[model samples]
Target: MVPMDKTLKEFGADVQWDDYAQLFTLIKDGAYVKVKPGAQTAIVNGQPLALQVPVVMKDNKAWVSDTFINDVFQSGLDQTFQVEKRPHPLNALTADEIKQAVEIVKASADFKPNTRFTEISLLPPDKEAVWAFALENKPVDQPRKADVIMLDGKHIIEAVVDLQNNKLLSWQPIKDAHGMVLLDDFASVQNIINNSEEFAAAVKKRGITDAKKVITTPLTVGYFDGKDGLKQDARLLKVISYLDVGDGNYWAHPIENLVAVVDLEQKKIVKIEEGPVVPVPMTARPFDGRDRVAPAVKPMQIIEPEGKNYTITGDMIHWRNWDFHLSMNSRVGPMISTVTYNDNGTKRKVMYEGSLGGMIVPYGDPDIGWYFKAYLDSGDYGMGTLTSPIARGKDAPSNAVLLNETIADYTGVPMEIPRAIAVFERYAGPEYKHQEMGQPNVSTERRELVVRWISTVGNYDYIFDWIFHENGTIGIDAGATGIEAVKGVKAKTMHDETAKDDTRYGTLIDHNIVGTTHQHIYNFRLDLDVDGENNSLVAMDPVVKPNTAGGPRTSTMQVNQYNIGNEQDAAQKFDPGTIRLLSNPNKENRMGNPVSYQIIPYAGGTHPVAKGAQFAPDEWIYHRLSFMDKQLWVTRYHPGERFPEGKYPNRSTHDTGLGQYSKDNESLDNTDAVVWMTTGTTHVARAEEWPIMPTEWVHTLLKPWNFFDETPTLGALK
Candidate 1:
């Protein structure tokens, strides 16, 4: 039996015991539960539930079953998610479903001792069914299934587990794939690095004799067309390390010019390259700011005495006129699905599903350690697995609501990530302002509801925000901040003799350190269902025209509207001068115009915009990646074509992602379509950003275009 006092405290519930009634009253989130000692049942909100074990009294304290909290939380009586009847069909797989799916897979013939789970996610029901339920209040009659991806040796096995019926549907093996780095592969790489005699000798030659002071990063070695002394179809990871120096931050002290290639399946170091030792930067530069003290500022608090303006039912959240389902994906970080806007007492479909398709951080230096340094943050390593748990007031506002997420780990066990997502409401400038040439004016502050998620990939922390405005605007803001990856050099300053060579591919940010140039390119997959499922891309370009009517201007400009004919035609670099939109031809407004939402991938940012990848035309990155080659790619909607950087992109040799998906040149006249929006910054590091970099953000916007009859924020303005 579990002790009642400890469980109640851990569950954040209050308890009160009656002297003569022989009852224990538990209160939490305005819900109550009453249990009597020596009884096998508990009354929760006037309903009786059978406890796994009877409550017992020991040392004047009550004891209950281990599953008492789970029972209460899932009893359909608490303020948490109501699981009796889920409102949305896109809700994430629950803990019970995960466990059942794992057990079912283990009992099947496909199970092996060397098998590992890459991911287990909810098999999304048909898009038509979800839209019907969201548009019309129809009862969802869909089957529940869990999509499972397992790695057996070097083979990738894909299957679907029937959770409701407890059966394995099918097992299929994918061809020519090297799956992601498993959790065990990380530990295996460390062990291989520590036990290698050659690696120890190389580091000892570089004045790094203490093995305990070394920290290794298991980096993915990019595909080199089998010319870089690497065999194909072998799972490998290149290991690079840094000196800790007992400082709180070890990123400042990079071990100069050493790399170890280790085969993950064989668990052995295949090769080791030792360049001339340039000496590790041993200066203790701690980023924790414990040595510095500053003046304290007065407290500024945000209070909502009248409570919030939003309501959450089941997994769907409703605020103002926007509602959507937000969940965590082990591969995609955060998934926003089935987004819709309420027009005039009618729910209008906006986007079907949206998430981070993929991202790549490519360094520009040509040294041995930086030559093949294109890191696919989400694809190579699980970004959602490396989620940084947000604090109340640090990462997000103190008034924000923190949410925990549970997803299957490499071992197929459900692991909970604490405070993985945050939701909050904030004020943004003014919604509108006007004056009628009188003594009075009119204005109102605009409020936005932000659903925030953060992922820390090694030295960088990425923040993703899905901002919903009342005026029918959906903004996605991506923020990057953390310690910059610096390289150890021989020059202490630019005036030194080795300065020119040391700062050739980088900047002298500090004494004997150079911060390399790189780019953080991001891609987002937006399955827009503008008004319904059928939509087309509209390109409205302003062109120079000659006016015969005679004006003072030599040339006049007019917008020429044209429908992009096919998928290949829709893939173009973003031109801010031209307006591109996803429009529904069947749906028209009162003015007889197509209802649409304008998609702006690169809006504005602090850093220089990444128009495209800053690489040569013959670079290896273009051969393996196509999303970074353009800012926008609109393709025909295909369920399997989700990730921009293919499923297994760790050591891919070809462009199996967007470059292959858009090869059909399918029609985009008036059918289901998906837009791939890409945006990023070319990071040029400086000295001021030394200790730690400030947050830099890039914005993507989706604005209403004749979708509503008038302004949508009038209701909230009152």
Candidate 2:
């Protein structure tokens, strides 16, 4: 008997063990093998084969006969992937191997007490797996598996080490990258404020005698407009302080407009900005509506069948005629893959993958304190790493099913985020309602399954929802809430004499404070695989033209159709009057119409659209990020190009992601295509959005346009 896990790893296959089901699956190349304990039946590539001995569990690990390798691997995978008679085995990183990696890092001179690990994961050999007959061309020495570890000390660092010999292979400092918060960072920032004499002196300079009475909020130091050199290798912190009045609502009692810039590596205050001591807005008290609750709301309930309408067999989910696989990436929160829908009895491909590519929040103020405030939320500070867990009955519906995800931290160690995602079905009103003169009303409940994930980037919490309707419509919505980052000002109201100039760049949302004008621009990367992989982008523009034929009026509404042949042609600002779609030219409906899904980038939201970058053409942000400047972009699919704002966007000098991706203007007609939809809001502050903001929503839709033969939900009522 042999340990199947190690054997599978040696064959370069991804293995998943299902302890509760007493089964294990190995996937490689596009093929998968599922084996159940105590059963001689083995499923290989969706085909069953009889085994000599049943897979069995021993010592809490799945084991199989020696013949298992030749039977499953040799027959299951593609012909190019053949097993050798004597193969060199390579195993995943064990507890000891992880410990060895830690020891190796500790031995280096760069290691310090404050240094913490961000992630530690296996580093497989770069060599591609090949047929056994190609052994003559193989390297002489057996490839040794290594561990890739990410360490965060004064700066982010990545190191690779050979596990077998415990030798450090390579090490380098990651200058512009920000790793996930270390267990020490949360406390470190708080401790730095408490012990810093400069910070205390700055607090007292604002006329607050008692420095200890001030409440400090640690904020990330955003990129400066290159006034300071770019090579400053330090973890910077910007501290915001408030007067801690005895009342719990300290936000109302701001001391003054003061900011302390601290360098974590140097353990000292780099600089401090001093401003006027404005009286706090004490009128802002418990705006959460918790003070008055006269009436109790009625209870609501959602009941499903004994078995859920959706089934989850591993990572893939099946609901009605829809099927897709869901996974969490370190950069993007919840990712959907291989989305397909069945019409009648025929299966049709819709999307290969879709997820939030990247997003930026750029403030409009040009003041020194507000300038260069464009934040690349996903690329700079990973949104997935900042996921705020959802509470069942509170965050989501009571009937929602919560999902936990495990991801590798910066040091490559696995961390489990419990209830990180939520999925549930809800009543979306009537799918269709029609009444005949002599017949009864015909209607059915419009049910939709929603997958949601939330992430808190500093002061704002963003909720992303991926909704699926039985009618073949898909919606991606982003809702933002949480406290607004208000700046303290001397002006109390718009009527004040000082208000004329003080409120130029922002609205006075509260007394002595202004809510800065900013734009929340989001980009969604949708890899649409309509019908199949080959797809084209077509624009349907509604135009008012003069009627030449028979018409009551001189002007009539007409649609102008055009094909976007290349990437450059496909990149343009979205027009609400124009309809864009990813269409399958190879497939058509019964009426000879191409199968397609309408791409609605800006489906009405509470706030106005951020038509383009809020910055001036000369702003430095234009060189760093390109996705937010446009609403729609169609590009040839390349797995390496995931983010809109390049990989290392922090203090980046130029656009390397979307800008470079479309530089060549690759042909996008009748080939694999990725659609990047950028949509968002230009937030203008109001008093109602003071202490805590109510959720404001922004929507993007992918409605079925002739993709379905007919109404997809018509059979639901039957």
Candidate 3:
């Protein structure tokens, strides 16, 4: 229920420093709302109230429940509800403000001449309280201005122009530097070069043996052997063993080639198969995902009608194999479709709208500040096609690159074929019609971008992607490849019981969706090494498993997959395709000569089944890494409000989806990451995935990935 706690002091009654309530109590209940402006009744709690609109307080009460504040009353829409918009206030930085920001830099710090404005970005609060500034010297110079304040009330920070290229950077804080936390991007680089004690101390704390271990340049020199399940790059020979952080009770994760070490001492990678590597079950799971694979067994031929078997009509071909129905249409080359299989009359039926392989790049425009805006304005097949024109049957325009593409794999190796591709540009920003109640009343400021991709495997489906950077912060993301099923028929969320928990992870992040709060386990094999050291595996493991609690009797793992004896008891169903046998699919890492490390929580998070996205206070919201997983599969999540009803990543309704999606993330409404990445292994039913199977879950993890030395380049002053 909504409560009335006007300020932190009031809301702080039972809140603790570490209590997540701090995030929930930031804004009083009902402080964020949407108003119809002239309606007569209030729409809330699945009921109508006497007063159409009023501030909701504790226990969901209002100061004027049955009365009007003045002669002017709110005009409530027939069916309307209030939703808080994230607070984003610095969205509008007037051109004048921009100049002022440039001026501040000139007034303070020293800058070299010829220093031009490189990259400027608006960051999440955690990155910087308000706005951040960055600048660079021409020709990829070291980051000049790291994160300098840009806006604070009336004062706009500015770094002096040129000034013979070296200018003073200024800070116009609300109260001087009292509440400021300043950063100097180039300073760290300089300190490292100088072998400053401070730099050494920090690196030591992280367990780096030598300062030479720092990554100063992009070291892209490695390849992953999908079928081999390891790295084959010639350079990945130097190596060592691996390490395991705590937390195993809740996550019985396997330690395959999750890590690789370049043995600086031995000059070769030592493949150690010491960790838990489990197998996947054969057969199908709840969603009857197996049905999706029926077409593989059926042969494709242009034969006339045969015995009691099948019929061919107008280029439509049919075939039967293993008691399964199959149909193929020549329109799109060779398309395979499977109909009902086990006919108990009540047998489960599955349908296929369309299926293709390859890679899909579902993207969102950063400049437009809305999701899928790029797809709509591209002037082609919505956003799926390129932004430019393409000859009807020719390849997509050379200059035109569609953000999302779905490809299919017909070759023996599903990992190599990026078959077909499709793009989705769906933007659900603000409700302009209900602005009066403050559902979302500001304009929009673009910042972070979100992208999702969906892919189908043997019998299972997978989703993942790469969150691109219109502003230059690079990182990868992974997600839980959960099972999607129809409503109800499955008994629970498509995720097998082994993949979820009812008591903790299953509170339903989204309302009404039976399996809204499920979780998945996805393991990522990053064949990347530090400083291009192909032999080294720096797997950043996330802290999964249960931890000692401070307040409530906190549960660690998802109950369904928490502490089950075997994979069968853990999941309602298991799939053989999801398992990792002793085969060591890797000709490199798993072979006699290889590199490996053991990491935890590869990638996994809560699963939602809601029709639309949900962002409730105190509720765990879904946040995806827009740049990483986009290549693996599509990840979709409801974007979070920028701030408390109306602050921070501040934004209001102005442009519609039709006009805004851009790669630059310029029109984004909020700033912070609203959702977290949910990752896991995709379950492809096989003979091994029978009634009782082994744990063949996919695991993906992320730790303090690099962000420019100490922090990311916040960009230049102007």
Candidate 4:
């Protein structure tokens, strides 16, 4: 039943409801619609119209037929309704906005000559105002502003700009923080290492005379207690040299025990750690299969008979009940924002923002070249700037619609990254199945919408996917695939006596080399505003109890749930034996249970997961990063708290990330909260993963727990 008075009022019509007369007078554009309860006759434009269904009152409100809207809008073809085209508040900064932000900063007095941008991002929207505009019809009127991270020489400057007014709102300086390693630094480091006399003298004794043929892999030096003469105040990178033979895989030939420290600002080699030289491996192993050893096969076809089920309007995407926006970040590859699932007619809140917070790939070994091997791919190097364009069929399905994203570069120019993300739909399995012996078969096919993104950091390629199903379940699948970083050693086989000591910290995957054991820990920052932002983390633990039913069995399994009191208590390692959920106390399901969404960081993986950081308690890495030590973290929302590793992780001295974000130990009782789910793999390499590793995937989930009143896949969708 359509309530004529309330519905018409929303459409800017003149609606007058009379209780005594039991009638509704709705007028729009010189047209009158007068109706009363239990009447088959209505007056429209002062003419008597015979209604197919009579207007009636059921709950003291005047109601009309289900086709009331169609009847009122008689000229449907010409007078068709138009959806409001207002842009979402969470939309990424446009190309015009980025250019304006640069102009606004450049004209300001705080502007410095030759300043570069770390990132140009939209400021976080107001919480209540955004929801008011989304849920209610209340319009949002606020100044369009941007938070641009800039670099003026060696300092990190945060500039706030008003795009509408073309004004610089504020100039804030973040002291003791260095800018990210810009793209220009990559070539500068290579050039500095190639022309260094100190580096040439050290490698000459190791039988490597030509420095240009030696590839330098620049690595960030994590905070250590001045043991190697590393000055914390300067921008620096420790260079690991590799011999580049004609084979094209320079990572295979490591110039062992040779290191050169490059000062990015000074453009010179500051120090060289020359240990006892080990001969470089000379293997002609090209990682890419140039060898022709394949049989021809028919190419598979992926065609949609009825065309696409998803509608994309620039950065916005709408598929079935799912609505979200996708954009690229120079630091984080794909950022999914303003996510909502339309439940019935009310648009329900699921997650506001989600993306890869940060990641750490730490290698195990105390050798001279391997001691400080932990690399923060996204935080330190801006991995999203290294986004690898997706292959049409190899990276995603042939039926996928690829999306290109534009983001700001260090030069403050908008660079368009093509096919950085892919969206496709596919049959996952059977949604439902039922067949009695005497009855007909009943089954429904399941469909899943997948959003895929990829970023390449040095030798590793990381793939991220967000999956939406017919049911109210959201899944994130993270994958790692690439060439393995191998080290050169003297031992070729276990038969040699030196093999025992050479392969101590790694496995012998190739002759005269060892694949170092490492960990790829992926931490996702999911801002799940489940049923509004007032949420609390609850741990449901099932325990064995004495049966009260007096049955033959003496024990029974009982479920018990308790809320996590504070921030420190919420940062814990997830146990699959128990359930973890962000619960909304103000809302409840039909069975009187609090509406909640479950958090499952890692599940159903073929490889062993990282339980915690592999480093010891006294290690400096543990003090710099804390998200890797726990699989699950819950903290109150804060705009300043972003990357899991400190913002400038290049020469970071302390834990300025999650460890500092959650240090307040604030109460988490039905307050606005955010969740961080960390999943990882303890990569113990083998010969199978030596040359090129197949994509190893780890699964994560944000599942509905009493969030829906019933099975969402029922006839409601049909």
Writing each residue's lDDT as its tens digit, candidate 2 over 449-502 gives: 899999887678899999998888899999999777776677888899878677
Which candidate model has the greater lDDT, 1 or 4?
A: 1
lDDT of each: 0.85, 0.73, 0.23, 0.83
Q: Worst lDDT window (10 residues) for model 1?
A: 78-87
Off by over 4 Å in 1: 1-84, 716-718
Cα error, residue 261 of model 1, in Å, equals 0.4
TM-score of 2: 0.76
TM-score of each: 0.89, 0.76, 0.19, 0.87
* Candidate 4 lDDT tens digits, 1-718: 7876677766545566777897776654324567777888777645676778887777766666768756754622212122438876767788899999999999887788878898898875676776676667476688888989998767899989898888898999988897877887778888998787778778788888676788988888877889868898887888898888888789888998887888877888988888878888887778776754678899684655234677766567888888877777889888887688888877889887789999999999888898898879998888778899988777998667677788888888888888888888989999888898999998898889999999998899989999998787999999999988877888889888889998988999888889998999999999889988999999999999898898698999999978898999999998878899999999998999998999998775656788899989788888888888999998898877777886777677788889988998999999889899989889888888877888899999999999989978775765
Q: Which of the two candidates, 1 or 3, achieves a greater TM-score against the reference? A: 1
Q: How far is candidate 1 from the true structure (C-alpha RMSD, Å)?
A: 6.3
Candidate numbers sorted by TM-score from highest down: 1, 4, 2, 3
Q: TM-score of the candidate numbered 3?
A: 0.19
Q: Candidate 1, 551: how far from true, in Å?
A: 3.7
Candidate 3 lDDT score relative to the true structure: 0.23
